[PDB]
Symmetry: C3
Subunit: 595 residues, 3 copies
C-alpha cells in the first residue's frame, strides 16, 4: 500500500524530469537546507531567484511567534502584480495566463498575459481615480470569472489590500466583512453563473450595503448584462470606467512586509478573523510550493478547481501559478455541470498537466459512477492534488485509478489559511505515497507533535498529539486585521515558542505525518472551513429557539423555547443559509426536548 | 517627371538645395556638429534607433542622457492598439532633478533662463541656483496645501520666468501640471480646470505682453465661480497693480514662498508616472497626457540633435509655455541639457518689429525657434528692421507649427540667417511630445518647405487614404503614419482613453495617425503639406493647403493666405482663398478684382488649372490660435454658411477677426 | 601679556591643564580612544573634515555610519544665504531603521534603554527587541489614524522609556515629531501644538518626577480646548490614576497597540525630509532633516564621548530638550549602544541619586547640565564621596558655561580625578555638539569648550567692524564659516525668521548669538550670550567671567549677573547670589558677605566688574533646560516686570515673585 513515483514522474515518456528526485533521501538533502541555523543561504537565494525585486533585501528573517513580529526580507521592495503579470508579459505577451472555463463549456476562452495585464492596469487606474491609496482595503465580491484575477492584482498593483468575500456568502456575511475591513470601495458583478443557475450578486450587494456606511464606490462587472439595480453616483460599470483609462499603470513599490490581502476565516471561537498576509514571503511561499509540490514546469497548464474566495484560490489559482508564469485555470462551473464528466472533459480539452481539488469533489464524482471517467485520455495529467480535509483511502485509490490511470502522483497537501502555502505534502518525484498521508514537511517547515496534557514535544516516531511548527516560515500569516491580540491568543499562546495549527496529527513508524483533524470546534464540510459556534449563533437568532448544539457533515440539535418538526428543520436550515450562506446549511437538524 | 512636387518657390529646384553652411561645419570656431557631415552620417546613426535591434541604442541614450534614481530593466513594451505604451518602466527619476538639481550641483551660477521682459530694460539672467531655489520654495508651498504625488495643479501664468519654476515645482513633487495660455477666456480656463479636477491653481495678478495688460487674476475669479474643486490659488505679483484677492483661498506667491525653505526633496517618479496634461482645442478640450522618462528623453535628444546644442549655447525659443513648443523647447528640453534657455515675455513687434533681432544681438543667442506666422508677420513689416543687425551668434534657425512657405523660408534664411545658418523645419504635434521629422543641421541639405527626414526612433510611412494601404517607394503622397511607438508619444487623453484610441490609433489600425497630409519625394524628403481635414478635392485633384498658399504668396504684396474648400456642383469642391496684403499695398490702383485675376493665373502656372481659387476674399488678418495656427475650419464653416456652429472662439488670437470674415463673406 | 584670560579659577593657570587620564589612555582595562593621544591626533583628523577637500571624509563617514536604502551622489550643496543647505540629497534612509532595526537584527537582547524610573525599585533594562516592538506597534497605531509621511505629531511625554518609542514611531513612518517638555503649561503646549498644525498628540495620563505628579492629561485637556486641528490623542497609562478621557478623541496606548502587529515597515525617507520640529522659547520651531542630523549626532556621540560597543551612556537630561533628542535617543541608539532614560531629578529621593544610578548600572559616561552640577555641589560631598563611580570614563557638561569652581567639583567628586571632562558647546539649531574636547586627545582647561568638532570651522568676529579676527588671543562673537551636516534647515513655516536670526547678522556666516574668545593656545572660551554682555565704563563684561569670580567665594552655590543702567558708568553690574544651605548669615551678616563678594570680583576682574548691588535669593529663575533666565532678571532690575511675558512653564514660576520682592 505504498506508491513510488510513477513513470510520469521519472522523466520517462518524454515528460519533464522532476525538480526533486528520485527518492526520499533526495527530498531530505534539499529540505535540510531550508530549516535550522544555516538555512538563510537557501532562503536568500530562492527569494532572489524566484521573484523580481525593485530593491534587494539585506536581512533574511527576524522576529517570531511570541509577539507576532515575523519578518522576511524586510528591506526588499517588490510588487505582486509586477511578479505575476508584467515580467511574464515582457517575455511572452501572447502566452495564456488564464484558461477561463466558463459555466457553459462553449463560452470558455484563453486570456493572454497581455490581455490580463491590460485589464488589471485599467482597473488599477479606475481604483486610483476613486482615491484608493497604498494601504487602503478594497472588498471584492466576485464569482469565478477570469476578471477576479484582474481585481485581486489591480489592488496589489497600487498597494491596496484586497479582501475577497466568497461569492457563496449571504448579504449579512458580506456586510460584516465589508464593515470589519472599513473599505470605501467594493468590486462586484451584476450576476454570477454557476452550474446553470444565476447568483443575484448585485441584489445581495445592495442589501448588504444598506448597513455599510463607509462604502462610497462600487465597481460592477457586467458578467451577464441582465437588468440589476444601480445606485447613481455610487455604482459604476466596470467596462465604462475602464474604457476611460490607459491600459498601463505603474506598480507601487511595496515593502516585503506591506500587507497584501485580508481573508476572513472561521476560528474555533468568535467571529471570522481577517487573516492578513504580507507580500514577499507569501508570494515566495506560493511560488515555491507550486513549483515543487506540483512539479510545475514552464509550459504547464495548472487546473486548480477551487474558488478565489478561499485561500486555495488565492495561492494556487492566482498568486502561485501566475508568479511562476504558467497557465492557470479559472473554473466557473461545478464538478457535475452539465454532467459529471466535466472535470475530465475539461482535462482533455485543455490538456491540463495538474489537477488540484478537494476530497469532496473526488468522492462526489466517484458516486456518479465510473462511466464518466473511464473513457478519457487524461494522459496530460502528471500530478493530482487533494486539499481541504482528509482524503479517505477509497477516494485516494479511485483518484489514482481513474483520474490518474495509475500513472499520476497523488499529492495530499495539508495547510491552512494562516500558513499561506502548503505545509505538508509529498514531493511527487521523490516521495512514495501512503494513501491518506500528507507525508513530509515542505521546505522551511519544521513541525513537531506535542502532548496537549503536557505541552512538551513527543520526540521520535509512532507518536500522536497536536501539530505545531517550531519556527516561522516565509508565508505565515502576520496578524489578524486590527485584532493582533486574537492572533497571539489563538496561535502563539497555547504552546509558547511554537505555532499551533489547531489540528491533531500522528507520525507513524516511517516518519509519515497523518493529519488527524481539528482538536478545536472547526469542522471541514466539503473542504470549507466552518465553525460550529457560528452555526449555533446563526440558529440561536431564530425566533423561538432556546438552545442549540452543533457537532461535526454538520449536525445540529435544537431545543425550542416553550412558546411540523420536519417543516421546522427547513426553516432553521434557511436561517443558517441566510446568516452564513447556502453552503453552510447543516446536514441534519434534530429537534429534542432537552440537550 | 515627378508625381510629387516641392512647395511652390520662385527659386528653381536646381538652385534650391542648401548644404550645411560653414557655421554648421565646425568652421569659424563653431562647435563641430554632433551628426555630420552628410545624409549618410544621419542614416548611419538613425538606423540604430529603429527596428528590432534598436533597444541597445535607446537603453544607452536613456542612461547617458538622464540621471536616474533606479535603473530600468525593460526598454519598451505595449503599443498603439490598446494604448499601453511603456518605456523604461522599472526606472525612477525626477524631471526637476534632471532640469535643475544636477546642473546646479555642477555650475550653480550658470544662466538657466534669459528672461526677456516685455520691456527690454527689465530683462535679466536667472541662474540655475536662483531657478532651483524658487522652484523648491514653490514646491514647499504646494506641499503645504496638501498636494500629493499624482494630484493635478492648474497653471495660468504668462511668459515670466517663474512659469518655469511653477512647472518644475509640480514635477518636483510629482504633481501633474496643466498649463493654460495666459489670456484664455474665463470659460476656456474653467473647462480645463474642471476637466483635470485640480484643487490648486497658480496664476499672476496681471501679465504684460506687447505693452498690454492681461487681467489674469480677474479672469481667474470669473472662471473659479464655476470650478467648485479649486481650494487654493497662488498669485505671483507680476505687476503689483490692485487685483481682487479672496480671503483664505488666495495667497501671494512671495508671502507664501518667504515662509518656506529654499530646498525641497525630489519625489522619486516611475518612468510612466504622468508628468503633465496639456489641453489642445474639433470638439471638447483634449487633455493630452505625457509621462515622465520617455517625454524627457525625447525632448532632451531632439533639442541636442535637431538644434545641435552644445554646453555654452543660448537657445532662444520664442513661443509660449501654454503651447507644447514651450513645454518641450523652452523648459524641459533645454534645461534637461543644462544649457541656457530664453523666456520671451513680449511679441515679435513690441516695441518695434526689430525686437527679435535686438534680442539676438543683446544676448548673443545661438539658435532661434519660432512659428511661420511670426516669420510671415516680420516679413510683412519689411527688411529695415533686420538688415542692420549682426546676428552672427546664430547657427540654427527653427520653424514650427505649420508648413513654412518657401517664400517665408527664404526670408528667414536671407535676413535672420544672412545665408549662414541652417534652417530646421521641425514637424511634430502635442501628441508626439518632441520633434518627429526635421533636418539634422550638421548633416542634411535642406529644401525650402520640407521637414526632410524622421528623427531617431521615428519610422514613418505614407498611406493612400483612398485604399488604406501603405505606398511603397519614393515620389508618393497621402497621409502620414508612424509604424511603431517612440519614447515621447502621448500616453492617453486625460480620463478619455477611448478618444485617444479613436483619434490616433483606429483610423489606420496598426499605425499612429497624425492627421496631416504628406508626401515623400524622389529623394526621400518628407513634405508635410497641411491637415487632412483641410484638403480640397477639385474634380479629383486633391490639393493641399500648403501648396496653394505657397503659390499665392509668390505674388507681390501678399502677406499671408488661407485656402478652404466649399461644395461645388460641377467640381465637387472649389477653392476659396482668404488673402491678407501688406499694409502699404495700394488697393485702389489694383482693385480687388484685378488682383484676384493675377492670383488665379499665378496658381494655375505653378500648380495647375484646377487649383485656381473660385473666389478670393481680402481680409485684414486671418483667424489664428494663440500659437499661430490658421483656423481654416472656422473659415471653411463660414463659407459653408455654418457661422453659427463655430464653437468656443473666445480665446483665439483676436476673436474680432471672425466678425470681419463673416461680413466679407456676406 | 595675554588679552584673553581664562574664566576665573582658584587654581593657578600653570596647574590647571588636565591631560587625558589613565581611564582615557586605554589603561585599566578601558577601550583605547578612537582619537588619541594628543592634540596633534585631533587636528590631523579634524583637518580632513573641513575645507575644500573634506567631501571624501564626509562621504565615507556617511556610508560607514548609517544604513542607507539608496546611496547618495552629492555630498553637500546650498548654503546660509538663502537657507538651502543640503547634505547627501539623493540618498534615502530611515532613522528608526538605523536606531532600532539594524541593531535588533544583530543583538536583539542587547539593552537599548536603561529606564531609571522615578522610584529606583521600578528601574529596568529594555532590550532593542522590546523597544523595536513597542515602536512598531505605535507606528501601526499612528498609521491607522491616517498619519502620512510629512505630517506633524505632537508629543507631550515625561521621561518614561516609551517616549523613545513615540519619537522613533514618528520617524519610522516619516511623520515629523514635535516634543514638548512634560509639565509645560496648557498655554505653552497649545501654542506649540497649534504652530505645527498636528492632528495627533501623544501623551500620558500623568507623569512622575521627583516624587511629584505632573497632571499631563489635565493640562492636555485644557490646551486642546484651543487646538482645533487635533483629532486623536494617544494616552500612555503611566500612573493608572483616574484621568478624564474624551470619547472618540482619546484612546489608551496599551489598548491601541494591542490591536496591532509588533512589526511595521520603514518609510524610505529622503536625506532632507524633515525629521522633527523642536520648539525653543513666539515659540520657534527649529526643524532638523534626517541624514545630516542623524550622522552628526552619531559621530559626536562616538567621538566626543569615546563611545564603544558595550558602553552604557547616561545622559540625564529631558527629551523635551535638544540634548535629549541628540544624546538620549538619536545618537546613542544610532550607535547601537545602551542609553539611559532618567525619569527622576538629581536630588530625589536624595542628592545621592546620580551616583546611586552610576554604581547600580555601571554607567560609562555621564552627561548633564551645569545647573545640575552646581545643585549637587550645593548639597555637599557626603552624597557623592563614598560611592565607587569607577565605571565612568567621561563626564560631560552642556547648556551654559561651567564655572571652573563647578568644573573642579565635577572632576574631583564625580570623576575622582580619573575621568575626562567634556564641556560641550552647541545649540538646538546646530543639531549636535559644535566645540568640545575629544577626551582621548585634548588636555582640558576648566571652563573651556576647547576645539571645534569635525566639520565645524569657527571664527571670532569683532562686532564693531564685522571683520574676522585672525589668529589667537582674540575675543568677539562666535560664527561658523561653512554649513555642517546637522545644522537646522529652517524654522517651521517661518524661513524668514531663520534667515534673519542666524544668517543675516554676519552675511556668509552662521551667527550663534554667544560671545567667545580664542586664547593664546587656540582654546575656545564661550563666555555667555551676546544679549547678556554688560558694559561698565567702556569695559565689556561677559556673564561667565563675573559669575565664575563670584563662585570662588566660600558658600556661594550659583549666581547670575545682569546690567543696570547707570548715568555715570553706562551700566553697572547687579548680581543675584544663592548660597549653600549651611552658610551662616548670622556669623557673616549679609552686608559683610556682599562686600566680600564685590571685593573678590574687583581683585580677579577689576572694579568695573564688581557688583554695585547684590541680592541674595533662594534660587534663580531657570528654564526646564537649566538655562538661567538673565533676561528676566535684567528686566526686573530695569523696572520692566510688566514686559516679562508668560513664564508659566519655567522651572519654578514662584521664583520670579521672590526676585520681584527682593528688588523692591
Ligand atoms: C487549505 C485550506 O485551508 P483552510 O480553509 O484554512 O482549512 C485548513 C484546515 O483544513 C484541514 N485540511 C487541509 N488540508 C488537509 C489535508 N491535506 N488533510 C487533512 N486535513 C486538511 C485541516 O483541519 C486544516 O487545519
Ligand atoms: C508642434 C505643435 O503641435 P500642435 O499645436 O499640436 O500642432 C500640431 C499640428 O501643427 C502642424 N504642424 C506643426 N509643425 C508643422 C510643420 N513643421 N510643418 C507642417 N505642419 C506642422 C500639423 O498640422 C500638426 O499636426
Ligand atoms: C545644547 C543646548 O542648546 P539650547 O538649549 O538651544 O541652548 C544653546 C545656548 O546654550 C548656551 N550653551 C550651551 N552649551 C554651552 C556651553 N557648553 N558653554 C557655554 N554656553 C553654552 C549658549 O548660550 C547656546 O547658544
Amino acid at each position: 500500500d505504498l506508491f513510488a513515483p510513477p513513470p510520469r514522474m521519472q522523466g520517462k515518456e518524454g515528460r519533464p524530469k522532476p525538480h526533486i528526485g528520485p527518492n526520499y533521501e533526495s527530498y531530505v538533502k534539499e529540505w535540510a537546507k531550508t530549516v535550522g541555523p544555516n538555512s538563510d543561504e537557501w532562503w536568500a537565494a530562492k527569494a532572489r531567484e524566484t521573484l523580481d525585486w525593485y530593491d534587494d533585501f539585506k536581512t533574511v528573517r527576524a522576529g517570531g511567534f511570541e509577539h507576532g513580529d515575523v519578518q522576511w526580507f524586510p528591506e526588499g521592495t517588490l510588487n505582486a502584480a509586477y511578479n505575476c503579470l508584467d515580467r511574464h508579459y515582457y517575455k511572452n505577451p501572447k502566452k495564456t495566463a488564464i484558461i477561463y472555463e466558463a459555466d457553459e463549456p462553449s463560452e470558455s476562452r484563453e486570456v493572454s498575459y497581455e490581455e490580463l495585464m491590460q485589464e488589471t492596469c485599467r482597473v488599477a487606474n479606475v481604483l486610483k481615480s476613486y482615491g484608493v491609496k497604498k494601504g487602503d482595503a478594497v472588498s471584492i465580491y466576485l464569482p469565478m470569472t477570469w476578471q477576479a484575477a484582474a481585481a485581486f492584482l489591480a489592488c496589489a498593483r497600487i498597494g491596496a489590500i484586497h479582501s475577497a468575500v466568497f461569492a457563496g456568502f449571504s448579504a449579512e456575511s458580506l456586510r460584516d466583512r465589508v464593515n470589519d475591513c472599513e473599505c470605501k470601495v467594493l468590486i462586484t458583478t451584476d450576476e454570477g453563473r454557476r452550474g446553470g443557475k444565476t447568483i443575484a450578486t448585485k441584489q445581495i450587494v445592495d442589501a448588504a450595503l444598506q448597513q455599510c456606511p463607509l462604502v462610497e464606490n462600487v465597481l460592477v462587472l457586467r458578467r451577464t448584462g441582465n437588468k440589476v439595480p444601480m445606485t447613481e453616483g455610487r455604482d459604476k460599470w466596470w467596462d465604462e470606467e475602464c474604457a476611460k483609462m490607459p491600459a498601463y499603470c505603474p506598480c507601487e513599490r511595496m515593502a516585503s512586509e506591506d500587507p497584501l490581502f485580508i481573508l476572513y476565516t472561521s476560528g474555533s471561537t468568535g467571529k471570522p478573523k481577517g487573516v492578513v498576509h504580507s507580500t514577499a514571503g507569501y508570494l515566495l511561499g506560493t511560488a515555491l510550493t507550486l513549483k515543487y509540490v506540483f512539479d510545475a514546469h514552464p509550459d504547464d497548464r495548472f487546473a486548480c478547481m477551487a474558488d478565489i474566495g478561499w485561500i486555495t484560490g488565492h495561492s494556487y489559482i492566482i498568486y502561485g501559478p501566475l508568479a511562476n508564469g504558467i497557465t492557470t485555470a479559472v473554473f466557473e462551473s461545478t464538478p457535475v455541470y452539465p454532467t459529471p464528466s466535466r472535470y475530465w472533459d475539461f482535462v482533455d480539452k485543455w490538456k491540463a498537466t495538474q489537477l488540484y481539488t478537494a476530497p469532496t469533489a473526488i468522492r462526489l464524482l466517484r458516486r456518479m459512477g465510473e462511466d464518466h471517467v473511464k473513457n478519457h485520455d487524461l494522459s496530460s495529467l502528471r500530478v493530482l492534488g487533494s486539499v481541504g480535509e482528509p482524503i479517505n483511502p477509497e477516494a485516494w485509490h479511485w483518484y489514482n485509478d481513474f483520474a490518474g490511470k495509475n500513472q499520476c502522483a497523488i499529492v495530499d497537501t495539508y495547510w491552512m489559511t494562516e500558513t499561506g502555502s502548503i505545509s505538508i505534502a509529498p514531493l511527487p518525484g521523490a516521495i512514495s505515497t501512503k494513501p491518506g498521508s500528507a507525508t513530509f514537511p515542505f521546505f522551511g517547515m519544521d513541525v513537531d507533535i506535542i502532548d496537549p496534557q503536557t505541552g512538551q514535544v513527543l520526540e521520535g516516531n509512532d507518536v500522536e498529539g497536536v501539530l505545531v511548527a517550531r519556527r516561522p516560515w516565509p508565508s505565515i500569516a502576520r496578524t489578524v486585521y486590527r485584532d493582533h491580540k486574537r492572533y497571539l491568543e489563538t496561535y502563539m499562546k497555547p504552546y509558547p515558542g511554537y505555532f499551533f495549527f489547531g489540528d491533531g496529527a500522528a507520525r507513524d513508524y516511517d516518519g509519515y505525518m497523518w493529519i488527524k483533524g481539528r482538536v478545536d470546534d472547526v469542522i471541514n464540510v466539503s473542504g470549507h472551513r466552518l465553525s460550529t459556534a457560528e452555526v449555533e449563533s446563526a440558529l440561536i437568532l431564530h425566533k423561538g429557539v432556546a438552545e442549540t448544539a452543533v457537532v461535526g457533515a454538520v449536525y445540529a440539535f435544537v431545543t425550542m423555547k416553550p412558546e411540523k418538526e420536519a417543516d421546522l428543520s427547513k426553516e432553521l436550515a434557511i436561517q443558517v443559509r441566510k446568516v452564513i450562506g447556502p453552503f453552510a446549511a447543516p446536514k441534519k437538524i434534530y429537534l429534542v426536548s432537552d440537550l
